[PDB]
Write a protein that binds this ligand. Structure first.
Ligand SMILES: *[C@H]1O[C@H](CO[C@H]2O[C@@H](C)[C@@H](O)[C@@H](O)[C@@H]2O)[C@@H](O[C@@H]2O[C@H](CO)[C@@H](O[C@H]3O[C@H](CO)[C@@H](O)[C@H](O)[C@@H]3O)[C@H](O)[C@H]2NC(C)=O)[C@H](O)[C@H]1NC(C)=O
Ligand SMILES: CC(C)CCC[C@@H](C)[C@H]1CC[C@H]2[C@@H]3CC=C4C[C@@H](O)CC[C@]4(C)[C@H]3CC[C@]12C
Lengths: 105, 439
């Protein structure tokens, strides 16, 4: 028989997942990208910690301790908006596709 | 009717395909992959497990010299020490201290624990790829299982389903893998009979039950402490124990493309790589002639709202006048917009409601019902949330062509500059013409 770590407190930002871990004992936290290059990373946590993960377009898979894995994907959210004024439109597309935006403009 | 389509290997995502058989009503099928498994062929090279060192009681001979013979045990050594004068709890071992020698020997054997606790070193070849496919056929849910090699076709409900070959030969498993339990690792294990001390493979056998054992523990017999009969030695610690502590992450956690790894048998599950061709033999009973099918006229579309939430956040309502009661098939005429419903019912004069998912900031698309296409368009809003636990239901927006509407600013600026060039070009042309004529 093995224990299962407490469900973490989770909040979200732009292409970002923030977790608060509350272990009783040392646990292993690890994650991988679900794309071609998994960029596998792992760490041990022996205390309450704030962990910030970056979410790729392909999606991110996160596994903590003996718990079932979580999967996350980004949405096309903006602080700018489509339509409206020309500067509102550029911000909208910049936030979603910043690389291309700088090239097209 | 033979219908051939190709879908992505992404698991848990439905795809819509249109069946076009002239003279009959267009039909729409829905396909989803429920599971894709890549099961490699393995050939066992050897078993690695813990070893035990066996040391028989030492032979102590005083007033004379001890001797021994070579043995053919997996790792054997024998040595004789001189000048030994051992004591027992009740006094000196023997009467004389002259010409005293001690005969020591030791050998390595496989542990009995190797029966249950061991790692297997395998060579991997190709995989017998197969998949579980869900198909929505004539409103019915049909589930089929088959090999993704373009063979071993299976017929269900008189429909013949052929899947594969796979567009990719990708596997998370390399040529050399080691299996301990539920954890598979990619490791360049050493050749059989070439193991080294303190490292994985220090002790090897071809099978768990085999009596043919290779070992390299660098076991060296040392001189005993004076007054004692103990047999000291120098030997490397088991490489198996070191490996278990230093295994690191297994493929289940490190594999690319979101592959799931399982053992007994070793297999890769639901790898998001490439695509899978599907061919379906459809019975004529599934086709309704256009003369028998219903027909729709006076069709129009409106959009109460649209949000590109990636989860069917768009809604559209289409008004129609039906010639008669019956069913029709609904299909998008663009790859930018996905319609959730495969089919709708039509009766008299009414309206139908469907949901859709798009990456477009401005939705511009045509909806095909029973051969009566309607153009529909509306502005879409962004989602409030940033992160979801599901994959998008739609496809990508990756073309410069799909920029939003109210982009007339681009056309106005481009046209304005183009006009300046066109005018300047005309001015120069006229002057050149006049200059040419003058001599
Ligand atoms: C078979 O055709 C469709 C699709 O087949 C689906 O069946 C369900 C039971 C699952 O096995 C699913 O994996 C499979 O794709 C059937 O329509 C499905 O009914 C689902 C009932 O559970 C329903 O799914 C979701 O919808 C409800 C209501 O919006 C929502 O609360 C839940 O998320 C729910 O799971 C959905 O209507 C549809 N499947 C999906 C996922 O879209 C249909 O019932 C069957 N027809 C027959 C009898 O041939
Ligand atoms: C006032 C004028 C300049 C507004 C122009 C807005 C233009 C420059 C912005 C708004 C939306 C943007 C596009 C959004 C989507 C894509 C798809 C991406 O895969 C490549 C970049 C591309 C094609 C962007 C190019 C730049 C873009 C078209």
């Amino acid at each position: 028989r093995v224990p299962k770590a407490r469900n973490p407190t989770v909040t979200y930002g732009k292409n970002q997942v923030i977790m608060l871990l509350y272990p009783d004992h040392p646990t292993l936290l690890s994650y991988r990208n679900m794309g071609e290059e998994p960029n596998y990373q792992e760490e041990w946590v022996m205390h309450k910690k704030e962990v910030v993960l970056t979410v790729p377009t392909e999606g991110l898979e996160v596994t903590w301790g003996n718990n079932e894995p979580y999967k996350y994907w980004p949405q096309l959210s903006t602080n700018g908006t489509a339509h409206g004024h020309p500067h509102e439109i550029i911000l909208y597309y910049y936030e979603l596709y910043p690389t291309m935006t700088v090239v097209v403009v | 009717y033979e219908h051939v389509t190709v879908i992505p290997n992404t698991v848990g995502v439905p795809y819509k395909t249109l069946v076009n058989r002239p003279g009959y009503s267009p039909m729409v099928l829905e396909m989803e992959l429920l599971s894709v498994t890549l099961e490699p062929t393995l050939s066992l090279d050897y078993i690695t497990c813990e070893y035990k060192t066996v040391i028989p009681s030492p032979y102590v001979k005083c007033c004379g010299t001890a001797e021994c013979k070579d043995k053919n045990l997996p790792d054997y050594s024998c040595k004789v020490f001189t000048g030994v004068y051992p004591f027992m709890w009740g006094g000196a071992y023997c009467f004389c201290d002259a010409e005293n020698t001690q005969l020591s020997e030791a050998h390595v054997e496989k542990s009995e624990s190797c029966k249950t606790e061991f790692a297997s070193a395998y060579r991997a070849h190709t995989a017998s790829a197969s998949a579980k496919l869900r198909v929505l056929y004539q409103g019915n849910n049909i589930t089929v299982t088959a090999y993704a090699n373009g063979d071993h076709a299976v017929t269900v409900k008189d429909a013949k389903f052929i899947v594969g070959p796979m567009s990719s030969a990708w596997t998370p498993f390399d040529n050399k893998i080691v299996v301990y339990k539920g954890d598979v690792y990619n490791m360049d294990y050493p050749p059989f009979g070439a193991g080294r001390p303190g490292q994985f493979g220090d002790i090897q056998s071809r099978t768990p039950e085999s009596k043919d054992v290779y070992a390299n523990t660098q076991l060296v017999l040392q001189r005993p402490a004076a007054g004692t009969v103990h047999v000291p030695y120098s030997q490397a610690p088991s490489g198996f124990k070191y490996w278990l502590k230093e295994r690191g992450a297994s493929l289940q956690h490190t594999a690319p493309f979101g592959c799931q790894i399982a053992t007994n048998p070793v297999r890769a599950v639901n790898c998001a790589v490439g695509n899978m061709p599907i061919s379906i033999d459809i019975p004529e009973a599934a086709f309704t002639r256009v003369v028998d099918a219903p027909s729709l006229t006076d069709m129009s579309c409106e959009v109460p709202a649209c949000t590109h939430s990636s989860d069917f956040g768009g809604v559209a309502v289409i008004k129609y006048a039906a010639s008669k009661k019956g069913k029709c098939a609904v299909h998008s005429m663009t790859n930018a917009v996905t319609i959730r419903e495969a089919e709708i019912e039509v009766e008299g004069n009414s309206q139908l409601q469907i949901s859709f998912s798009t990456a477009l900031a401005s939705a511009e698309f045509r909806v095909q019902v029973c051969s009566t296409q309607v153009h529909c368009a509306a502005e879409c809003h962004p989602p409030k949330d940033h992160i979801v636990n599901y994959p998008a239901s739609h496809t990508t927006l990756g073309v410069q062509d799909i920029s939003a509407t109210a982009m007339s600013w681009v056309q106005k600026i481009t046209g304005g500059v183009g006009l300046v060039v066109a005018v300047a070009a005309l001015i120069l042309i006229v002057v050149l013409c006049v200059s040419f004529s003058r001599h």
